[PDB]
Amino acid sequence: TTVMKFGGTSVGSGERIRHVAKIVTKRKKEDDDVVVVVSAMSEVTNALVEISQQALDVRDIAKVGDFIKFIREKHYKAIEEAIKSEEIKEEVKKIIDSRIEELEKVLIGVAYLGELTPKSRDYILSFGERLSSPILSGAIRDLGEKSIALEGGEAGIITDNNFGSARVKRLEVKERLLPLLKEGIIPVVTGFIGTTEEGYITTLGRGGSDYSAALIGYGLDADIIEIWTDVSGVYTTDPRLVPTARRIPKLSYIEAMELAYFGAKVLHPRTIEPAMEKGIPILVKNTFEPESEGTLITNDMEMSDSIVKAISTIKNVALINIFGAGMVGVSGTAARIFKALGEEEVNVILISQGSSETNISLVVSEEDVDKALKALKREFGDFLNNNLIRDVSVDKDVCVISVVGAGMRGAKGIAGKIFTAVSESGANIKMIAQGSSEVNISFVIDEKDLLNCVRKLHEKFIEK
Amino acid sequence: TTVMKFGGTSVGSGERIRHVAKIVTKRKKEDDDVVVVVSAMSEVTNALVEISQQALDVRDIAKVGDFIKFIREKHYKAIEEAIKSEEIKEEVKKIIDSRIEELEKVLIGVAYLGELTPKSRDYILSFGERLSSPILSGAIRDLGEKSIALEGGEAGIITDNNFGSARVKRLEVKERLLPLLKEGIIPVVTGFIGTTEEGYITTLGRGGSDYSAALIGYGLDADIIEIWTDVSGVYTTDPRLVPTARRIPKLSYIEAMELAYFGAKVLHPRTIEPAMEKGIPILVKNTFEPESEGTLITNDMEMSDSIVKAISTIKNVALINIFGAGMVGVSGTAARIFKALGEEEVNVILISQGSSETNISLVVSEEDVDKALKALKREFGDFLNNNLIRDVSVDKDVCVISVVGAGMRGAKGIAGKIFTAVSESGANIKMIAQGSSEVNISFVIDEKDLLNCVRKLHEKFIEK
Amino acid sequence: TTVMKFGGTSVGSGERIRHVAKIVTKRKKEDDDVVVVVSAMSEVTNALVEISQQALDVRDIAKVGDFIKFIREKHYKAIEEAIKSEEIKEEVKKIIDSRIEELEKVLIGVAYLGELTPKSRDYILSFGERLSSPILSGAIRDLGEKSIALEGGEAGIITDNNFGSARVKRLEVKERLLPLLKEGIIPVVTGFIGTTEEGYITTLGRGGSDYSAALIGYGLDADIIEIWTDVSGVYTTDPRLVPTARRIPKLSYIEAMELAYFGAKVLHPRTIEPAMEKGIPILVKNTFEPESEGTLITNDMEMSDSIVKAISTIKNVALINIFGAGMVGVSGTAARIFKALGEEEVNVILISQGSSETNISLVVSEEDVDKALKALKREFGDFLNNNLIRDVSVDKDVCVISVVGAGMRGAKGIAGKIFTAVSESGANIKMIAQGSSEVNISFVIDEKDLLNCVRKLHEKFIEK
Amino acid sequence: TTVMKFGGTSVGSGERIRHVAKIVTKRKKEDDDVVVVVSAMSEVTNALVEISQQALDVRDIAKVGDFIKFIREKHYKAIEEAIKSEEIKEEVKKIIDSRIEELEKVLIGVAYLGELTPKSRDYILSFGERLSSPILSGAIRDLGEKSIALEGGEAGIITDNNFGSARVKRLEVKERLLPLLKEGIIPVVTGFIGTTEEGYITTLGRGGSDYSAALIGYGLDADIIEIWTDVSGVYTTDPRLVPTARRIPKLSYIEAMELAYFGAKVLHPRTIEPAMEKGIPILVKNTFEPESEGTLITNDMEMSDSIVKAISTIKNVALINIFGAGMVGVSGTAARIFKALGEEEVNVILISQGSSETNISLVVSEEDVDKALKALKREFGDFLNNNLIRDVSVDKDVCVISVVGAGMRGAKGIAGKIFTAVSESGANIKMIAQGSSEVNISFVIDEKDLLNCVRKLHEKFIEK
Ligand SMILES: Nc1ncnc2c1ncn2[C@@H]1O[C@H](COP(=O)(O)OP(=O)(O)O)[C@@H](O)[C@H]1O
Ligand SMILES: Nc1ncnc2c1ncn2[C@@H]1O[C@H](COP(=O)(O)OP(=O)(O)O)[C@@H](O)[C@H]1O
Ligand SMILES: Nc1ncnc2c1ncn2[C@@H]1O[C@H](COP(=O)(O)OP(=O)(O)O)[C@@H](O)[C@H]1O
Ligand SMILES: Nc1ncnc2c1ncn2[C@@H]1O[C@H](COP(=O)(O)OP(=O)(O)O)[C@@H](O)[C@H]1O
Ligand SMILES: N[C@@H](CC(=O)O)C(=O)O
Ligand SMILES: N[C@@H](CC(=O)O)C(=O)O
Ligand SMILES: N[C@@H](CC(=O)O)C(=O)O
Ligand SMILES: N[C@@H](CC(=O)O)C(=O)O
Ligand SMILES: [Mg+2]
Ligand SMILES: [Mg+2]
Ligand SMILES: [Mg+2]
Ligand SMILES: [Mg+2]
């Protein structure tokens, strides 16, 4: 049983979709049980995000119409360039048209109301995958193989209703997909969406298509989960930032999970857990260079000589420094800080506390800064005094660099190497986290020093 | 207005008490408003701690009697060697005898019940200072100066009733002490004790006499708070561990507060806050070398060349690693972790979190390990799962080293220097905290590598 | 300064609106500072409620169009019958048309989404007052007086964003209205709506127009708040249930507040507080019989001979009986009951507890029953046992009768009279509340005995 | 299986103890399985209460010695007058002497410490039953029957450690007592005491000996629980207040439980629950008139003609009126009121709320008033305002009268009868509770009108 997932750029045009369909069809000959997971076409999810905000804010009906036509012409051209059979094009075009009708109605409905609830957002975003999957399914049929397009929910992914980033409650992947596989059918499952208990469409978070593939793999006790993307596996760092980056042939579950979590976009962080806990390997491959061995992610762990195996970054973060009111009890005031932040669903990436004043340093998701300040003000309001917090500063022009490798925590002398290197790059360290991870050290520097810092780190540990 | 505080060893014998009385009496000529704060005689607080536990556990009435006689003979010999006037000795001996009566009754009562409540503990411990203060007060009278002995509460220190480490509620230091100063009297205020709203005797935590001095300073809007101890101020590290340690002439409030907080015993950490918030300078001096300039603690801040100005350690700590259950939300699970720890009054010194598994690293007070595990088990009990925690390990054979200096957080390259140094000492770093403090970097290593690590750090940054 | 509020029926047609405009214009000659508060036209708020639910549930676009036309024709006919000047009709019709456009877009938007958030509800409801106020303002101009129509928010009523029943945060009534009054302008402020800090339209709860008048009165330090309705003041009971009901010329703030609170619809319960705390009198008058003295509500308090001065009822309630698990501590289990109910925003009208089993009796708002049971089940789940609750029963076929009068609590023998009377009416008492109010005794009986009970109570105490 | 409990007065002298031993020995012939539960001798528990407070406060060692001798002479005289056999007297006198030794040591231990913890209180109180039980056991042996004295804990009553009123966790009554019964032994179990998991002596609350009997009955699946006291069953009211009171032959569990709960001292309220839930009947009998049929408490329920079957009072209560801050939400503020009161373990007997100001009326245990105010002040501190509470008044000169009977809640017209009757007695009603109980109506009047009110109530409903 092989589940194969294809990203945005991998299906960025009709030609590429056909190319993908060929890849899938070749696997069908090696393993007869093949399930496909497909993302929205290149750049459409972003367009759906921004039209959602436009329909809400400016409320221009003709700007919606402009959008619909951009979507129509992108997917029409895709159908035309991916499928040869006229009968099949005609079949796929109809499905696409039903989707565009619904999309149009909902965007107009949003404009008419001037309201865009989290539920409506998810519905709108799901159209990306619901428009691309039938085109790929059709192209697979066009190559003489049986295929139907399915949505995440009907493929067996049931979530709660925390729209925007629903968490998985329940799987019925066997129940939904096994009958189809038995008939020899290749299901093309929509990437980043699932369903509520009552059938409401739900998204799993940006980059969530990867996670879908892992869920389906998990559900089906698959032999392998294949991640097909636009680079040949997981590299020593992001090859679009540092072009001398090198493919890492083998990586462990925890190494990959930490990298993904800390900014190696190639994998959504939630991809690893389901595969990890059933020992299903993950093979990351390049659709544009399908001959490459890529990266195999399993249980096996090997330490590297220089120890640091890879470097990831997150640009979209803010450093929040909470200033405590003195010797007021760190666990007590941390209890209240994280209750407030947790209530507001603020996503904290990093914590450090080591201060006689009960100060604490946090890294949050940058877009969560306003929710965070609002939450802290609600909780604390405004030395003999009973007060716990004194003030709070934010720095948004900041980033998190992480360094990941097999024996990181245990490796004598590596911290000093990493930090002298950081210094020599011209960066000033604002925060360090070490201790909570077997394989990871993260730190915070100014956003402007990102590129230079990553390069120096790459030079010292990977290139030599 | 000058408040002068004298430590345990400073009054470790009658001869030393007389010497201290001379020091005070010489200040009386420079400033007419002098208040003394005095600790229990050398080693008696410890003896009181251990007799409390013996009276509770083994319940031996004659072992209590052995203790009383040790206390009687230590303080009798002190009266005899500190005071010349027979009339005054006879006067001080009576006060001491009233105290010994009460001490004896309470220890026997403890043995009879087999119960030692936090309230009873504090009462027993307070005897140290309540036995030493009248001896010093009598020695000050013996030198022809007016003096009476006071207890913390009646000197105006009012606390809550969290026995063991009561926090200050309210000050009436002006109201209680001003009338006495106006009459030209030198009050000898007992060190580490205060009073509940209803007059129950309360202790301010071990090493609390320093804090009393700061409180009385704060209350009286004093010109200076003098800490008289057995070393000539604050040193680059603990001079009893690394004898090449150097006196630091000048230190800022925050620098001193972090060092104290992180194990420079010379100052209780709570000493700084009251002095800091009123800009009252703190002068640390050696009673055994009273000519030394010592250390002046004020607002002034000067960066050092090598940046690290001092090194402190805490031996009595444990590393607690809580293992999370995956991608379960760090602020949500941190809210529950610290709620539980905060409820159990567990004292956490250090936090670090940087882990896709939602692991967190904490440093706690070592004696608090059992309270901590009990609290975590109560809170969490025992990936589609809803569980937040997976497991929790403790390592007690561990210490915290801190490095303190004016421009620490901002100083380019210092982390790398510190950590390469740590490595070269043969130490393995288990945890790092950096970011939450302007002047401090703390890390955790094995207990066995403490001495070697401090030496190497001292060599590189202080000696060169 | 006079604020005059006019209810639904008072402006139930164009003819009535003109009649109201005349009333206002006559006041303008007695006091030059007049502010008007106006409800939605008779029956339209109810129509807006029900179209909201239809647009959500059935989602029929033509049923929305039917509604729009009903609204259009009601308000067009009103403009035509209230205003003589063609130029003014033309001016008011345009404002009405802008409102109907917005109304239509929003209802369609609701139907397209199948979502009706509390925010959307409030926006939709607000159209009642936003459609009636400009018609009244135009009629006031038609009589040669200066007037403009304002919305609650822009008139200075700022609320939180608890949509459905927003509570007032802040008033800027002076700042917004004083400039307009200085120019001699009569502002016609929309009744039951206010605004969020960010300008989101908000409602104050059903019957809220009364409360708006009191707020505006409070904000302006008005000399009088006039409530113009369809009865001549506050009567001994609801004159539509018991036609022998008598006008009460004078009533105290607390007497009126209890009656309103307990079902005398003539005043929203929140009307009294702002007027009470600034000692601004409330004059309740009949728009259809404007010569009647009505009811004056002030600080003055006079006891009546028979003590009971008035009877109110609430039909829309449920009796909830929580059965406790024995001697489990009433305050402890009450703490948990009311936490759960408070969290779910369940409105409890009455409490009684006097039971060895820790049973408690509550009266809630009937529509809140489901929220209540859901909250209790969440809190308690399912004699040596630790459990606090045993079971819980509901009775919806039930009502609350209250009896209000100046010296009620203190009056010897009145409870016995009230209850023998209740008995003789054929009613069976399920709950009694007495003690917490100076002027009120409330009890619970079967819904079917309401009419008979009120009559007997009215006969004995009012008619004799 | 018959458990027989004997109260304080029932064993108020040696003569009475022998008389009780005869009663037991006569039952032994009708049922071979007899367990005895015995209270402390008349008036000694009270003496132990007051000596506990004296030893703590004044700390007079000779006042303790006076007490010991009073206890010694009371129990010596008892041994002498209850037992004939010299060998047995000698045997029982030794047990008594071991108890007096322990008692003496503990009281002196308290004086020496000046501390009386809840744990020490319970230990001291338990001596009453621990001194009386061996005397009764010896008297039972003196009549040629086998008997040993046991303590509550070792008889199988295991509690938590909430000293003063520990609640039962666990029963091992079968395990401890069955072996003894099989040997034909009559165990004399101490009344109102149990044991902690770790063997710490614990009391079940004043009047708890009744509850012990019920627990032992429950544990043993007894056929009957017999309550032997100084009146012939449960009367229509307290026969020492109203001498025309009449024995009620038959009463249901719930009727008896409400009466006990509301002041019919004859039964501790907790007696009913264990007997009720296993359908074990309770027979209340007079030891001084052992031929009377007394009162049988079972499941059977019969309505009386006049409906009110009995009247109970609690003198030791206070009325607390919390004044709310207006329309601030009753369940929300009730949540916070009862949280605070529940935390402080304040015992609330009665609740009533029916007020537009969010006032609430409570009845608490009078000794709990200070705890209650301290709790409310801690929770709330000190109309646009956010505040929930306005003020709070207490009235200690107040009592609760309850009226109990089979069909109370359902009975048409009874409330009116009760309350006109109350009025005619000259009482003024401050609070009414009705609704939460099937069989009970409670109200609050001035303490001074208690006697007169009870009389009038008794006259109208019982005597006619
Ligand atoms: N360590 C890394 N190894 C490989 N690719 C990385 C790494 N870090 C970041 N990337 C980026 O991830 C991109 C592929 O991920 P993504 O944009 O999500 O495509 P897909 O549509 O397949 O999800 C690559 O273009 C690369 O720039
Ligand atoms: N940085 C430091 N400088 C000086 N002394 C230190 C430092 N760190 C720890 N100490 C220890 O603090 C001691 C003085 O404090 P303490 O033992 O509490 O005596 P006191 O009774 O005067 O408080 C010295 O003996 C010294 O060894
Ligand atoms: N005790 C009472 N006295 C007078 N009117 C009452 C009383 N109780 C209820 N009402 C009802 O309140 C109605 C007026 O209030 P309402 O229906 O809100 O109209 P509006 O608020 O629009 O003027 C009257 O028609 C009357 O039946
Ligand atoms: N309703 C009632 N019926 C009978 N006795 C009552 C009632 N209410 C109170 N009592 C009192 O209860 C007393 C017996 O109980 P108590 O004083 O607890 O003695 P014991 O030691 O037997 O428990 C009687 O002396 C009587 O005055
Ligand atoms: N199409 C979604 C999901 C994915 O890319 O995997 C996104 O833009 O994030
Ligand atoms: N005497 C106390 C307090 C102090 O010395 O400051 C102790 O030994 O901790
Ligand atoms: N709009 C209000 C009318 C009023 O308050 O008079 C309602 O219908 O509840
Ligand atoms: N010693 C107990 C005996 C009893 O249950 O009455 C008491 O006085 O409360
Ligand atoms: Mg991706
Ligand atoms: Mg010290
Ligand atoms: Mg109304
Ligand atoms: Mg009793």
XYZ file of N, CA and C in Angstrom, chain A residues 326-424:
297
model
N 9.550 41.233 40.125
C 10.500 40.841 41.165
C 10.378 39.393 41.587
N 10.646 39.133 42.867
C 10.692 37.769 43.402
C 9.297 37.264 43.723
N 8.491 37.071 42.687
C 7.053 36.838 42.882
C 6.602 35.388 42.642
N 7.555 34.514 42.352
C 7.285 33.100 42.174
C 7.128 32.780 40.706
N 8.146 32.156 40.115
C 8.122 31.904 38.674
C 7.025 30.957 38.200
N 6.787 29.844 38.898
C 5.744 28.905 38.456
C 4.331 29.469 38.588
N 4.101 30.270 39.626
C 2.820 30.932 39.830
C 2.487 31.926 38.736
N 3.446 32.775 38.383
C 3.209 33.779 37.353
C 3.293 33.176 35.943
N 4.024 32.075 35.797
C 4.039 31.347 34.526
C 2.716 30.639 34.311
N 2.091 30.205 35.399
C 0.784 29.563 35.328
C -0.222 30.518 34.708
N -0.183 31.772 35.163
C -1.116 32.796 34.711
C -0.786 33.317 33.317
N 0.507 33.436 33.010
C 0.924 33.841 31.666
C 0.414 32.861 30.596
N 0.639 31.566 30.810
C 0.297 30.556 29.815
C -1.178 30.181 29.788
N -1.883 30.360 30.901
C -3.338 30.255 30.895
C -3.930 31.294 29.913
N -3.528 32.558 30.069
C -4.037 33.652 29.242
C -3.697 33.440 27.773
N -2.448 33.074 27.513
C -1.992 32.827 26.154
C -2.688 31.611 25.554
N -2.883 30.580 26.375
C -3.532 29.338 25.956
C -4.996 29.546 25.633
N -5.668 30.346 26.461
C -7.057 30.722 26.222
C -7.220 31.417 24.871
N -6.303 32.328 24.559
C -6.365 33.108 23.327
C -5.838 32.323 22.125
N -5.472 31.060 22.377
C -4.916 30.141 21.362
C -3.630 30.657 20.717
N -2.879 31.443 21.481
C -1.599 31.962 21.031
C -0.606 30.812 20.929
N 0.078 30.740 19.794
C 1.034 29.678 19.528
C 2.451 30.088 19.932
N 2.952 29.532 21.035
C 4.320 29.829 21.493
C 5.322 28.762 21.058
N 6.396 29.215 20.409
C 7.384 28.347 19.774
C 8.547 28.043 20.706
N 8.832 28.962 21.628
C 10.044 28.913 22.432
C 9.809 29.605 23.770
N 10.367 29.030 24.835
C 10.316 29.644 26.168
C 11.710 29.625 26.805
N 12.039 30.700 27.511
C 13.218 30.719 28.360
C 12.949 31.611 29.558
N 13.254 31.106 30.753
C 13.212 31.900 31.976
C 14.414 31.602 32.870
N 15.104 32.662 33.257
C 16.290 32.547 34.089
C 16.593 33.945 34.544
N 15.835 34.391 35.539
C 15.806 35.793 35.913
C 15.271 35.971 37.328
N 15.980 36.751 38.132
C 15.557 37.023 39.503
C 14.326 37.908 39.539
N 14.034 38.559 38.424
C 12.882 39.461 38.354
C 11.610 38.776 37.875
N 11.700 37.476 37.641
C 10.597 36.674 37.099
C 10.242 37.040 35.658
N 11.200 37.620 34.942
C 11.065 37.845 33.518
C 10.976 36.520 32.793
N 10.392 36.535 31.602
C 10.324 35.352 30.763
C 10.356 35.776 29.291
N 11.035 34.990 28.468
C 11.139 35.287 27.049
C 10.360 34.263 26.251
N 9.534 34.745 25.334
C 8.725 33.867 24.506
C 8.895 34.203 23.037
N 8.791 33.183 22.198
C 8.666 33.395 20.764
C 7.273 32.963 20.319
N 6.538 33.883 19.703
C 5.209 33.555 19.184
C 5.152 33.790 17.678
N 4.024 33.421 17.075
C 3.852 33.383 15.617
C 3.736 34.710 14.852
N 4.009 35.834 15.510
C 3.976 37.180 14.879
C 2.586 37.710 14.575
N 1.750 36.903 13.931
C 0.374 37.325 13.727
C -0.419 37.192 15.021
N 0.156 36.490 16.002
C -0.489 36.278 17.301
C -0.148 37.326 18.346
N 0.723 38.268 17.993
C 1.134 39.314 18.928
C -0.046 40.063 19.549
N -1.007 40.481 18.723
C -2.159 41.245 19.225
C -3.058 40.444 20.162
N -3.314 39.191 19.802
C -4.030 38.262 20.668
C -3.289 38.050 21.993
N -1.959 37.996 21.927
C -1.131 37.786 23.106
C -1.186 38.954 24.090
N -1.043 40.173 23.577
C -1.087 41.373 24.411
C -2.469 41.589 25.033
N -3.498 41.348 24.231
C -4.877 41.433 24.673
C -5.123 40.437 25.807
N -4.560 39.237 25.673
C -4.735 38.183 26.672
C -4.024 38.510 27.971
N -2.806 39.023 27.859
C -2.021 39.392 29.030
C -2.629 40.577 29.784
N -3.161 41.554 29.042
C -3.819 42.717 29.648
C -5.091 42.305 30.384
N -5.849 41.383 29.794
C -7.047 40.845 30.441
C -6.730 40.101 31.746
N -5.621 39.361 31.759
C -5.232 38.540 32.907
C -4.611 39.342 34.056
N -3.803 40.351 33.733
C -3.051 41.085 34.758
C -3.530 42.521 35.034
N -4.342 43.074 34.136
C -4.893 44.419 34.316
C -3.852 45.509 34.157
N -3.786 46.389 35.153
C -2.778 47.456 35.206
C -2.221 47.609 36.624
N 7.075 46.340 45.611
C 7.469 45.023 46.126
C 6.570 44.560 47.282
N 6.005 45.518 48.019
C 4.952 45.228 49.002
C 3.659 44.964 48.252
N 3.663 45.384 46.993
C 2.567 45.188 46.068
C 2.359 43.707 45.762
N 1.142 43.368 45.345
C 0.777 41.985 45.062
C 0.987 41.625 43.582
N 1.216 42.655 42.763
C 1.306 42.525 41.306
C 2.409 41.559 40.841
N 2.159 40.868 39.725
C 3.061 39.833 39.217
C 3.874 40.266 37.990
N 3.252 41.069 37.129
C 3.886 41.570 35.904
C 4.127 43.088 35.986
N 5.183 43.562 35.333
C 5.605 44.958 35.436
C 5.402 45.699 34.119
N 5.611 44.985 33.012
C 5.604 45.551 31.667
C 5.769 44.406 30.663
N 5.642 44.701 29.368
C 5.867 43.699 28.322
C 6.283 44.334 26.999
N 7.437 43.942 26.459
C 7.886 44.465 25.157
C 7.871 43.422 24.038
N 7.610 43.883 22.815
C 7.612 43.025 21.625
C 8.653 43.481 20.620
N 9.274 42.521 19.949
C 10.193 42.810 18.866
C 9.796 41.873 17.746
N 9.265 42.447 16.668
C 8.768 41.667 15.525
C 9.834 41.444 14.445
N 10.887 42.261 14.463
C 11.962 42.183 13.466
C 13.013 41.173 13.892
N 12.586 39.918 13.959
C 13.319 38.896 14.682
C 13.015 37.566 14.017
N 13.925 36.605 14.150
C 13.686 35.266 13.612
C 14.251 34.178 14.525
N 13.778 32.950 14.324
C 14.260 31.780 15.047
C 15.092 30.918 14.114
N 16.344 30.675 14.495
C 17.195 29.713 13.792
C 17.311 28.484 14.660
N 17.081 27.335 14.047
C 17.290 26.066 14.705
C 18.354 25.248 13.989
N 19.018 24.407 14.767
C 20.058 23.539 14.286
C 19.707 22.159 14.819
N 19.644 21.182 13.924
C 19.131 19.850 14.253
C 20.145 18.763 13.908
N 20.285 17.788 14.814
C 21.197 16.657 14.622
C 21.155 15.593 15.709
N 21.359 14.343 15.303
C 21.172 13.147 16.134
C 21.604 13.194 17.613
N 22.831 13.605 17.900
C 23.271 13.564 19.291
C 23.459 14.936 19.903
N 22.604 15.890 19.524
C 22.786 17.309 19.849
C 22.937 17.640 21.336
N 21.931 17.280 22.133
C 21.927 17.589 23.558
C 23.158 17.004 24.246
N 23.467 15.744 23.928
C 24.584 15.017 24.544
C 25.986 15.373 24.069
N 26.087 16.057 22.931
C 27.391 16.324 22.299
C 28.168 17.431 22.980
N 29.276 17.035 23.595
C 30.189 17.957 24.252
C 30.720 19.002 23.260
N 30.659 20.272 23.654
C 31.295 21.357 22.913
C 30.552 21.957 21.735
N 29.404 21.383 21.385
C 28.687 21.824 20.183
C 28.019 23.189 20.339
N 27.522 23.483 21.543
C 26.867 24.768 21.810
C 27.833 25.921 21.567
N 29.039 25.794 22.114
C 30.089 26.788 21.934
C 30.480 26.986 20.481
N 30.547 25.887 19.728
C 30.830 25.983 18.303
C 29.717 26.748 17.605
N 28.472 26.322 17.830
C 27.316 26.966 17.206
C 27.265 28.460 17.499
N 27.433 28.833 18.760
C 27.322 30.242 19.116
C 28.507 31.130 18.698
N 29.754 30.642 18.788
C 30.879 31.413 18.240
C 30.622 31.633 16.739
N 30.149 30.593 16.055
C 29.801 30.722 14.639
C 28.744 31.799 14.421
N 27.671 31.773 15.227
C 26.604 32.770 15.138
C 27.173 34.177 15.282
N 28.015 34.353 16.301
C 28.687 35.619 16.566
C 29.498 36.097 15.352
N 30.334 35.205 14.821
C 31.214 35.513 13.694
C 30.437 35.878 12.443
